[PDB]
Amino acid sequence: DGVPVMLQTNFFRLKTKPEWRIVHYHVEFEPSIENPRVRMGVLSNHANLLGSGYLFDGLQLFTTRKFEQEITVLSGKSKLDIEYKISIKFVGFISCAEPRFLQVLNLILRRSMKGLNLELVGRNLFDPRAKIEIREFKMELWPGYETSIRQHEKDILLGTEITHKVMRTETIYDIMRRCSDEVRVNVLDLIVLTDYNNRTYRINDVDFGQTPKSTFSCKGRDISFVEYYLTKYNIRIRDHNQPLLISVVLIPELCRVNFQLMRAMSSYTRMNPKQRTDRLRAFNHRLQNTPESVKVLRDWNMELDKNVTEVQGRIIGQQNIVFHNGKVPAGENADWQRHFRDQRMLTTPSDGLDRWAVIAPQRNSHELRTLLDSLYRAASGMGLRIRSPQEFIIYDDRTGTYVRAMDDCVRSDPKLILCLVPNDNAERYSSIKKRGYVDRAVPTQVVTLKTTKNRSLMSIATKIAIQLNCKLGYTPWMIELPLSGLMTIGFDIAKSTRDRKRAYGALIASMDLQQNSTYFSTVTECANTLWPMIAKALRQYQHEHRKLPSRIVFYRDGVGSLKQLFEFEVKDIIEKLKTEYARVQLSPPQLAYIVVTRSMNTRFFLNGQNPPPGTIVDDVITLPERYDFYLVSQQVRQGTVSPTSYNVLYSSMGLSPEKMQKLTYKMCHLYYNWSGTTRVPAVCQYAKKLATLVGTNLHSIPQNALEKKFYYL
RNA sequence: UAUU
Ligand SMILES: [Hg+2]
Ligand SMILES: [Hg+2]
Ligand SMILES: [Hg+2]
Ligand SMILES: [Hg+2]
Ligand SMILES: [Hg+2]
Ligand SMILES: [Hg+2]
Ligand SMILES: [Zn+2]
Ligand SMILES: [Zn+2]
Ligand SMILES: [Zn+2]
Ligand SMILES: [Zn+2]
Ligand SMILES: [Zn+2]
Ligand SMILES: [Zn+2]
Ligand SMILES: [Zn+2]
Ligand SMILES: [Zn+2]
């Protein structure tokens, strides 16, 4: 297996009495009461059990004290001094396996979090007082804490994580003032979010005949909107002339209406492990000093441990990266970029770069020649025979000029087309990719002008040569794979920039890497559309190997909703694998279905630092019902590691869990755009890359001639 | 769009 270690976490133990159980009763009153809240008060009258925290819904009762039998209390109610007889009938104990166990624990912990007086939303606690406003980006970022609870045979654990909820400063009242019928045309059909209650509404009309001074009727009381929002949310309405949004009746003053913004926010969110540990200990000490939360915690006779729990784990040994003539170890820092310097790629076309073209404008011939010299040198050092491409010098840097050059050049049937661009323009890049992959079938390479002027142009040209070798459909390196007839599938999905109502699903499939070591890639728009792609992959596999694969490892990017995706995806997959292998009158293959999730909620560290690549936590902090584990595969220079969560829904592989984990760590070594281990298995990162390319730039399905090439890299 |  690997080298075992002990790792710091972000969980604290909830210690209770050694013999500590939860008692559930059903409660009823001799004088019947049509209102449950009155019953709650009537039971609250009993102080013998009041000091102990108890959960009463008007019928179900959860408490700690176990009574002698079915027990009955009696007293006089506050209203009319009516003699009431409460019949508290014993139901039983909540088993450690019942989900009501964790539901009761969640309600208790939420009651405790209430003492901190933080806005509670789902499993998150926010501090709106501590909002970070940004008028530069017109957005407010609220810090907060994400919470989770885990059950183990040894105890009960409670974990926290830093979280940031972002929202837009722009309000619908501001949009209406910018327009000032046209306001109604601009506002109707939009979705707004109330800043006092995490609810969104579709505005269907705007009533100009009503104001915040108008009144509505609740369940019994009549009240104005100003009074309602001052008494229910302590929110003051300053503008009295504004109209009302009718969806419910909302106030516009109180209604609120990516990849570079992600960079800015990451600059504001990247955190050293020590800083995250400090903020976590601060939150713990805050909850510990608050007497309101401590009262709730102590009433149930359970104590937070101000000390962090640590887990047993193991670090996978370094894996061997194979090239033509030899193989190298990955290293303690799982990066091998230093190694292809004076090393040859695994699979190289004997033809080499026998026919390709280069399109560039007349102004940038000098930088183009520099780039081409670097490419020749680097690709020759890699084993890639590159010859002189076809010169395609255009005059203007416009998009139509590039498109026309491509269409005039394709007539010579080139293996590849490299295009030198002036700047970082998504428009011309998307148009180039669309003309290359969708309308025609030519793998292309784009180089930003700033790249040519880079001082370290030689290592850049080496990485570009690796990318080009992949674009041709050849293999730069390979892992040691002790399995026969294995097909690894990755699959992911992406939203579209042109239309948010469509999504693209990309599927990547290996072809018995110990022999063929190539990949097959399909995309389709969102009638389950994934099985056609799986069938295409199996057909290509049997057309290349004269046989179907014996084992299949399916990596799924998603996620709880496990039950839904388990049922639908896995059941249909198994039935249709039965069917497809029955077409060949064969038995269905060994199948492993794993859901890959980047769990930013659960973290763990080694000696207070980021764990090294290959670290694994199996079945301690993981979910009890699931057969799953955590893996750290990609080391991070800066920031905090987000471990990957691999959840094996179905497994008929006949492989030990350690073997499955080692195979997954191996498959994490095969993303050719990155000279090291990636955060996810390689096929999954390929699927994400292809789906993002289709949904962001291509907006259409690429031609089927590129099925065996890494054109999307 | 060398890479994310
Ligand atoms: Hg249990
Ligand atoms: Hg307008
Ligand atoms: Hg009311
Ligand atoms: Hg050409
Ligand atoms: Hg899909
Ligand atoms: Hg993925
Ligand atoms: Zn019950
Ligand atoms: Zn050779
Ligand atoms: Zn050739
Ligand atoms: Zn120069
Ligand atoms: Zn995904
Ligand atoms: Zn255990
Ligand atoms: Zn488009
Ligand atoms: Zn690329």
Numbering used by the authors: 93 to 272, 280 to 346, 361 to 370, 380 to 648, 655 to 687, 690 to 843
The authors write:
The PIWI-clade Argonautes (PIWIs) bind 24–31-nt PIWI-interacting RNAs (piRNAs) to form piRNA-induced silencing complexes, which silence transposons and maintain genome integrity in animal gonads. In contrast, Piwi co-transcriptionally silences transposons in the nucleus, by facilitating heterochromatin formation at target transposon loci. The Piwi–piRNA complex interacts with nascent transposon transcripts and essential cofactors, such as the zinc-finger protein Gtsf1/Asterix (Arx)13–15 and the adaptor protein Silencio/Panoramix (Panx). The structure revealed that Piwi consists of four domains (N, PAZ, MID, and PIWI) and three linker regions (L0, L1, and L2), and it can be divided into two lobes (N-PAZ and MID-PIWI).
In this study, we purified the endogenous Piwi–piRNA complex from cultured fly ovarian somatic cells (OSCs), and determined the crystal structure of the Piwi–piRNA complex at 2.9 Å resolution. Indeed, 32P-end labeling of the RNAs revealed that about 26-nt RNAs are associated with Piwi, consistent with previous studies. These results indicated that the purified sample represents the Piwi–piRNA complex core (residues 34–843) lacking the flexible N-terminal region. We observed relatively poor electron densities for the PAZ domain, indicating that the PAZ domain is flexible in the present structure. The resulting model is consistent with the anomalous difference peaks for two putative mercury ions (derived from the crystallization solution), which are located in the vicinities of Cys271 and Cys317. The 5′ end of the bound piRNA is flipped into a pocket between the MID and PIWI domains of Piwi, whereas nucleotides 2–4 of the piRNA adopt an A-form-like conformation with their Watson–Crick edges exposed to the solvent, as in Siwi and hAgo2. The 5′ phosphate group of the piRNA is recognized by the side chains of Tyr551, Lys555, Gln567, and Lys593, and the main-chain amide group of Val568. We observed an anomalous difference density in the vicinity of the 5′ phosphate group, where we modeled a zinc ion derived from the crystallization solution. The zinc ion is coordinated by phosphates 1 and 3 in the piRNA, the side chain of Gln589, and the C-terminal carboxyl group of Leu843. The present structure revealed that Piwi has the DVDK (Asp614/Val653/Asp685/Lys818), rather than DEDH, tetrad in the PIWI domain, and that Val653, corresponding to the glutamate finger, adopts the “unplugged” conformation. A structural comparison between Piwi and Siwi indicated that the structural features, such as the N domain orientation and the metal-dependent piRNA recognition, are conserved among the PIWI-clade Argonautes.
